[PDB]
Amino acid sequence: AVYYNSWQNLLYDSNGNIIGFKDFVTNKTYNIFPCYAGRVSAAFHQNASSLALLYRNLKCSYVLNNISLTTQPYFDSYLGCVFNADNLTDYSVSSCALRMGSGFCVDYNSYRFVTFEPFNVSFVNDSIE
């Protein structure tokens, strides 16, 4: 940082929050960023004995390294890291009780992470010419 003058040691935003500081002892300048906060989207089916967990917009590496270690299987979906659900986006369902967003569904038989395709085109094999 080059914006600290001799008398200045704190960086503030428009709302009065501290977002950076120059250390008094070492003169080293830092930016201050908030620690991560967020929710877990849990998909539950009445017939199941466990939960499917979706950490929205978080990669599985980030979840495991910086939030919590778990023994459940995981994979990186479009919506974020998904726990305890099989990645089966090549499969499709027309009805969905656990809608996760962006055309993705959690389907319970275990939980499966599948695509939600509620509507089809009726197809005929007649010629278009």
């Binding site: 935003d13 709302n15 009065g16 977002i19 930016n31 960023f33 908030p34 991560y36 906060a37 967020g38 929710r39 929205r56 917009n57 978080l58 990669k59 980030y62 479009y78 919506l79 969905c96 809608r99 967003g101 962006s102 055309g103 939600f116 395709e117 509620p118 509507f119 089809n120 085109v121 009726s122 197809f123 005929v124 094999n125 007649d126 010629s127 278009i128």
Partner: protein, 439 residues
């Protein structure tokens, strides 16, 4: 009326004009963690907030109801788009994109799931690229909240404070695929969205229904097709200008961002407390006085959440109204042509097409636009032969070459009077021009 004839300007030349219309059918699904918003990380605040009981539960329940309403609305819109659509399995949009000299290439994306998410059309691609915060835009912005960047995105701050936009249950790619399927349903047999006839014939019949003789329509078919795809190109190019439909689309995102920022700003109001920071209060006071200050913050933040919730309910009511209008337009302007004059845009509406837009649908209304006019003397009726009255069907009776002839009301083209273009009456009305020599 000079004698029995009035002066009327009847078009002698015409073009086809395209008009955009964006109708909002969806809005960002805002979810609030009331506990994280009101109390952040602070155990002393969560303890006091738990004494307020069902307030955060009520906020969560109302927002869940609102978001479920949005989801059901999106499902209904998709169902309306996909209703009655029958497509040939031989349809491959990579090669079949124009028919009868009308180019639908820009209005059609990839057909079938085998092409993937590329089902979005060139038109919809051009429209989506100019709006950053679509569903995928929100997903990417929230993905970047743990990338370690030095950029302080407002969306990341909002999400860290419990304010997050969730993706819709159906991705906009799916909606674009639905609109593509609806659009190609008019291109090719069985023409399930074009009244079971070729698109050009449907356009010709729609123009003829306005009072235009079939002769000029089927003699100027190439000119009509050129005018049609020129109107489509005019719409597409008008998106680059300060277009009103693009402004309306961006207004949804801008208003959502303004509401979210205003809600986040509530976390910096003191509401009469010594500070808006729970950190400062808890580092200044013991539990007895800290509780007094934290209670003022809890009350201010819960009031702000309630106000935002009421606003969101009111806004989603209008979103539902707009979605109902959009479904009605899909049914009665795109898939068919309901006899309602100014429902599908202004002017002499010929036909309408629909394309996917961020948080809504964009309708392209194509109209019959007269270019030049001829002022002619017209008769609204004639008393002919044995005092039998005749009235013109979607036209007028004109004196041409000192002879009574018929012309359409929307295009000057004198043609002989016949039962095709005449309503018969057993007794002619008064002020009907006398014409004993006719028929």
């Amino acid at each position: 009326s000079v004698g029995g004839l009035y002066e009327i300007k009847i078009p002698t030349n015409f073009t086809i004009v395209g008009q955009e219309e964006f109708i909002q059918t969806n809005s960002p699904k805002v979810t609030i963690d009331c506990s994280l918003f009101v109390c952040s990380n602070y155990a002393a605040c969560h303890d006091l907030l738990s004494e307020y009981g069902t307030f955060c539960d009520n906020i969560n329940s109302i927002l869940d109801e609102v978001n479920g309403l949005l989801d059901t609305t999106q499902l209904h819109v998709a169902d309306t788009l996909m209703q009655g659509v029958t497509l040939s399995s031989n349809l491959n949009t990579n090669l079949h994109f124009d028919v009868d000299n009308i180019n639908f290439k820009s209005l059609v994306g990839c057909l079938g799931p085998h092409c993937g998410s590329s089902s979005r059309s060139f038109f919809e691609d051009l429209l989506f690229d100019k709006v950053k915060l679509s569903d995928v835009g929100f997903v990417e912005a929230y993905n970047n909240c743990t990338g370690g960047s030095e950029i302080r995105d407002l969306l990341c701050v909002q999400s860290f404070n419990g304010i997050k936009v969730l993706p819709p249950i159906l991705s906009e790619s799916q909606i674009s695929g639905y609109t593509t399927a609806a659009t190609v349903a008019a291109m090719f047999p069985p023409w399930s969205a074009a009244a079971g006839i070729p698109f050009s014939l449907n356009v010709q019949y729609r123009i003829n229904g306005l009072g235009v003789t079939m002769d000029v329509l089927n003699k100027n078919q190439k000119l009509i097709a050129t005018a049609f795809n020129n109107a489509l190109l005019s719409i597409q190019n008008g998106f680059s200008a300060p277009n009103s439909a693009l402004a309306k689309i961006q207004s949804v995102v801008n208003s959502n961002a303004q509401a979210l920022n205003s809600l986040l700003q509530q976390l910096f109001n003191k509401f009469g407390a010594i500070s808006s920071s729970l950190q400062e209060i808890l580092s200044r006071l013991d539990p007895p006085e800290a509780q007094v200050q934290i209670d003022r913050l809890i009350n201010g933040r819960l009031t702000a959440l309630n106000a935002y919730v009421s606003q969101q309910l009111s806004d989603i009511s209008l979103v539902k109204f707009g979605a109902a209008l959009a479904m009605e337009k899909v049914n009665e302007c795109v898939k068919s042509q309901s006899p309602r004059i100014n429902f599908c845009g202004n002017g002499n509406h010929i036909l309408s097409l629909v394309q996917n837009a961020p948080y809504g649908l964009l309708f392209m209304h194509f109209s019959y636009k007269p270019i030049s006019f001829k002022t002619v003397l017209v008769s609204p009726g004639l008393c002919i032969s044995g005092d039998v009255g005749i009235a013109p069907k979607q036209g007028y009776f004109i004196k041409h070459n000192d002879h009574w002839m018929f012309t359409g009301s929307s295009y000057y083209y004198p043609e002989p009077i016949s039962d095709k273009n005449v309503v018969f009456m057993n007794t002619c009305s008064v002020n009907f021009t006398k014409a004993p020599l006719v028929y």
